[model samples]
Target: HMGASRLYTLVLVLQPQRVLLGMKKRGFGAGRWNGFGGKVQEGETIEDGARRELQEESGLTVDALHKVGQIVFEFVGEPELMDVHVFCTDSIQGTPVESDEMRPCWFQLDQIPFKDMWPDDSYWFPLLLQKKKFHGYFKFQGQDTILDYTLREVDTV
Candidate 1:
């Protein structure tokens, strides 16, 4: 009966090599793809709930956000622990629109797609395309295996 850990928010929209992603089209990671965000509400601030879930799942609009990572997933019995926070940005401001629960896409950092995403995003997505600063802790066993994990590379995230 542990509860508290649940303040999500993902938002990754890099550029220079390409990265914005979405494609949920439903609730809780519908078909996967990923990054935009959710949860973290009441009284805001967690970077304004990651800029209001990346403008409600991809209308895009960021001023600055470079936290990089911090995961925690754990979903075996699910007692609460999904403290995701991730954030990244190459500066944004509209153009990926596809709302009603995501659809925007534009991957090219070597055509990311990691088999349609979320297996701890292929282990911190190469430490977020090498912009480093990470911290993870997966442990799923349901929506696509990944029974345990532990990533690192961090200097503050």
Candidate 2:
């Protein structure tokens, strides 16, 4: 496994008219508004880690989740690619709270602030919201610039 890729996650807390996202307060991707999730752990399933990361980052418990998408992210000069598992859910069980790692906030569907999110996010997230499963790959030239990508909606994961 000399050059094996790392795995991560991204999740959205969906509601009838809004969705919850987080502003990362520290570490990689800090300052960007995005769905909550991180690396998968040793013994946890992907969805389990998604729920855990949400609670850890926002103090919210996600009881039910829909595994909606997946993406592979590669940075131009970096050796390891990031494989991200994406999930979403409207069923939730706790009030949102800001943790040291992320600041939680909600936004109406039409009011999503795409400008403050990772550039590739804008492309794939909308497909997620539409309830379609997706697969994508994004190659980045720098922190915020996407050099190329391929995204598509599929009937099944």
Candidate 3:
């Protein structure tokens, strides 16, 4: 059975040969490399929330965000699920800068530090890099261990 769900957004800035990622400095995903995003605000659209979070966390903004994926994350002992909407943009404005929440860095496509990211990332990241739409569900025992998951490329996000 499922409980209530919270809506969240995650944005990835993609370049021809590199991707912009942030090292979370505090709060939920602290100490891991991940995309820039947070909970969607009540008045804003999901895409707007993604853009806002990207700018707030990484000091970068995007004019166009392509919807690339959706993922549901379930943690054991917790009833609520994080329903995250994922976006990617190759077009961006402003330089990447560090924020109180995140430190921005660009990783070469082949050099993404997956070992330092959320375990579920490695699964869907490839699909993202391939420009495929995807959806997934991940159940975790804790922050570090994925108890089970199902991920697949989809025709629609």
- lDDT of every model, 2 decimals: 0.85, 0.89, 0.93
- Could you tell me the TM-score of candidate 2? 0.95
- lDDT of each residue in 1-157, candidate 1, tens digit only: 2566888888888888899888898876699888888889889888899888888777777779988888988888778888988888998976888889888889899989989888779888888888898888888878899877888988888
Q: Flag regions of model 2 displaced more than 4 Å.
A: 1-3
Prediction 2 global C-alpha lDDT:
0.89
Candidate with better TM-score, 1 vs 3: 3
Q: Model 2 Cα displacement at 27 (Å)?
A: 0.6
Tens digit per residue, CA lDDT, model 3, 1-157: 2779999999989898999999999998799999999999999999999998998887787779999999999999888899999999998988999999999999999999999999999999999999999999999998999988998888888
Tell me, by TM-score, which candidate is best.
Answer: 3
TM-score-superior candidate, 1 or 2: 2
Error of 3 at 1 (Å): 6.9
Candidate 2 collision pairs: none
Instruction: For model 1, name the residue pairs that clash.
Output: none
User: Against the true structure, what is each candidate's TM-score?
Assistant: 0.31, 0.95, 0.97
Candidates sorted by TM-score, best first? 3, 2, 1
RMSD of 3: 1.0
Task: Report each candidate's C-alpha RMSD, comma-separated, in the order given.
Answer: 14.6, 1.8, 1.0
